[PDB]
Amino acid sequence: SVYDAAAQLTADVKKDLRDSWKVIGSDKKGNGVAMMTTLFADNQETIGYFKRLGDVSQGMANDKLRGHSITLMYALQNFIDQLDNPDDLVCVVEKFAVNHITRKISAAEFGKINGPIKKVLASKNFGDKYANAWAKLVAVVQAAL
Amino acid sequence: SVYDAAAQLTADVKKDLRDSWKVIGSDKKGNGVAMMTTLFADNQETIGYFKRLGDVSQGMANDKLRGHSITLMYALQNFIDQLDNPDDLVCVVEKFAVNHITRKISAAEFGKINGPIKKVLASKNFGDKYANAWAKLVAVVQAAL
Numbered sequence A, B: 001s002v003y004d005a006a007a008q009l010t011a012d013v014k015k016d017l018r019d020s021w022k023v024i025g026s027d028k029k030g031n032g033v034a035m036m037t038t039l040f041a042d043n044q045e046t047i048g049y050f051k052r053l054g055d056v057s058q059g060m061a062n063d064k065l066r067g068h069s070i071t072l073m074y075a076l077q078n079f080i081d082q083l084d085n086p087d088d089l090v091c092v093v094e095k096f097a098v099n100h101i102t103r104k105i106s107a108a109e110f111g112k113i114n115g116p117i118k119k120v121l122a123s124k125n126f127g128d129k130y131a132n133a134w135a136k137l138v139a140v141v142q143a144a145l
């Protein structure tokens, strides 16, 4: 249940999400592309889904990948801004869930983003505590897939 | 080209866009839904395109419409944040252009959003000068359709 999952976002989890987002959200282009390239490097089997983006190995030089990556960060910004109201968080989560359901992305495969997030956070000196907080937010989307 | 349309946006236009966005972008849920409901009220012929959202006459109560409306405002937030780097603005614009090209939305049809934007701006006392500024930003997307 997406609603039960959303209920897991306690006061402490919400603060950790906001505190870490202040840092990684300040450079959407840089961190967005970093998240994507890490996903492709650590999980080669997912590259097939991103056929439209072309040669993703080009990274920042790939205009489609850069546009996609920046936009992905605004999806996260959206989630963060909705933390105060669970009903609004749920409706935006289900909107993006549909974007992935149509792409045939399962909850299990969506969860492969946790690795990349953990690594990007770690590069900015945010440890497991923060990685786990983000895993709970990702879990809300997983519940809708 | 899209780059040409983007590179054209002058300092004064960007100033008006950012000044007005500070206000209408401060209540994404409220103004986003207002924009969509106005589009449906003034251009009833577009309702059919949004059948995935269900009964759009439900307004704020429609969770799918609310989720869509909030997300649409983040696309605009994205545009506004990229104003000073045409290269980044172009790649995000082309990303969203694809979202509409796949739905068979022509440049002319996409321009129907200007009416609703003008009205929402006016509700906050931003006159024609501001509506014209926004029409220029919308024109950047039209250059990609």
Ligand code: HEM
Pocket: A046, A049, A050, A051, A052, A053, A068, A071, A072, A075, A076, A096, A099, A100, A103, A105, A109, A110, A111, A112, A113, A138, B099
């Ligand atoms: C934090 C997690 C993630 C977020 C916030 C997210 C967000 C997004 C957004 C906003 C889009 C664009 C939707 C559209 O315009 O159609 C997108 C597209 C896509 N996402 Fe994700 N995504 C995430 C994780 C993943 C993962 C882990 C996979 C794959 C294993 C995935 C696969 C896709 C695919 C295939 C597309 C379509 C790309 C295209 O052809 O343009 N996403 N995602």
Ligand code: HEM
Pocket: A099, B046, B049, B050, B051, B052, B053, B068, B071, B072, B075, B076, B096, B099, B100, B103, B105, B109, B110, B111, B112, B113
């Ligand atoms: C300020 C201008 C506009 C912006 C920034 C915008 C933004 C968006 C965004 C972000 C999406 C979601 C893309 C996806 O997840 O697939 C969307 C979907 C859509 N847009 Fe727009 N849009 C605008 C104007 C229009 C206009 C004027 C029309 C039609 C005359 C239109 C028709 C559509 C349709 C049919 C969808 C699909 C809705 C669905 O089934 O979920 N858009 N738009």
